[PDB]
Symmetry: C3
Subunit: 213 residues, 3 copies
């Protein structure tokens, strides 16, 4: 019973590694110029903020018996950090440079603030509930982009901006982590990951629809 839970966690984590390779396309495009035209820099920053707070949830002081999420969000957050660090010097125009760096300062300092406030002001079991609520809120907030790109596919009647390799992996990742939180009976892990399972399932199905015809 335990073994299956742990295996599920490892599987979900390793699956997340695949989703993390998705933004490499714009990063290929940076050598010429890094804006990117038609695209906006902040989401990567946003994603890292999320991964930070979730990593906070993962740590043993906040919630006991919840080790693996700290692992996936940790390696994920670090890899994101690499992205923003790469962006800011290669940023186009000083204005963009300063904006992204500033927002980064905001994220790091703020996360330090909520980490500190969380560990100081809150005693168990409240601490877990709070950091949990914030984590679930972040994960749910993130889902906006896949829903939007789904909208774009419907509008264009074409998968012109939606890759399958990324999508299938994310579907598997949500299913796995949903199983993780469900088996662990921790709601904060289960719910958003289940919602992600739904959004991904819709993604795969609609992809079948527009790839077919």
């Amino acid at each position: 019973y335990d073994i299956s839970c742990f295996a599920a966690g490892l599987a979900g984590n390793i699956f997340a590694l695949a989703l993390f390779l998705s933004p490499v396309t714009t990063f290929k495009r940076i050598l010429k110029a890094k804006s990117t035209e038609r695209f906006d820099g902040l989401p990567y920053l946003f994603s890292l903020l999320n991964c930070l707070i979730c990593l906070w949830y993962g740590l043993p002081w906040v919630a006991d018996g919840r080790l693996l999420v700290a692992t996936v969000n940790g390696i994920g957050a670090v890899f994101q950090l690499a992205y923003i660090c790469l962006f800011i010097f290669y940023a186009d125009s000083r204005k963009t440079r300063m904006k992204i760096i500033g927002l980064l300062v905001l994220v790091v300092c703020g996360f330090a603030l909520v980490s500190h406030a969380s560990v100081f002001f809150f005693d168990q079991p409240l601490r877990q509930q709070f950091v949990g609520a914030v984590s679930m809120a972040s994960l749910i907030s993130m889902f906006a982009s896949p829903l939007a790109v789904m909208g774009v596919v419907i509008r264009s009647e074409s998968v012109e901006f939606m890759p399958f390799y990324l999508s299938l992996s994310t579907f598997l990742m949500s299913a796995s982590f949903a199983l993780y939180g469900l088996l662990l009976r921790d709601f904060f892990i289960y719910f958003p990951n289940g919602l992600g399972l739904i959004l991904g399932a819709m993604q795969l199905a609609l992809y079948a629809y527009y790839s077919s015809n």
Copy 2:
């Protein structure tokens, strides 16, 4: 007792008043029905509304919150009506983009709702369940208020009450008042707060209607 009877009277009153609100888009859907076009109309609000009605309906049901059944009844009959609407629309939709958009959002709302209901009964044992489904529900209902506030804005800017009918505004004012009374009697915050907030909005709406209708 007098409290049981009053509670039922308030709940039912809210139900009957609300019925007008649910039947309000029947004119637009009749016009949609004519010439079988959804080109001119959208279309999405029925999804946002169905999601809301389901989550409040879940709250009403006896497993999550007991003795608040009339809420389940209004939200249920309401959800069926909205579902009929999105179905009529979804087949009568003009262009594949609109039809498939509505289909997708429908799958999204229904599966999502299933997820939150199931999680609610699974992960949560009483009374926290009631508190959770309550907060989610209250959040939804308060979120709905965006549209009438918006049309109040349109009325003020256009100095016209074209998009604000008194019959509807008054009826919804009454349902809000009634359910506000309902929660108030039940001493249920989750019922009282959003409908009370709605009572304020309906009151302002009726007032602005008075101000701008007179001339």
Copy 3:
């Protein structure tokens, strides 16, 4: 006894005095409005949002909601009064009937709504859950206000000009945020510390930006 109290009251008073500059900040606009007698160039909503914030926080400050929260009621009270004065001047000096009606309607919504949530807070909730509720609502408000100065920082970074964003205002705001942060810190009240800690961060970033 411990050095809890001595720092505790002084932090609140000092923070309040530092805070005073922010409430007087838009008076320049009203000076420019008073000569103008228009309000065309300016809208209009921010004074209402700010009044809403100030009432929710003031309610939190009251002994009805929270015991031992004395200074907060004071600063938020002075704030609410000033904001109400602003809204009255804007609404009377309003440019166009549309603006006048927009503002009057929203003022009605805010005052009526706040009274509503006050009543519900004191009615439905018994301690300590009440303080937790009014705290959560207050915190959401205060954090919500923070969007606008961040917006002016965005405008400054994007537009090379450091127009708007006063150093006096920025320093005063950093100081008030920091002080009330210490107040929440000593009280071990999360709802007080967290938004003000965030304010200390935003003030720090702004201070950094004056060093263009």
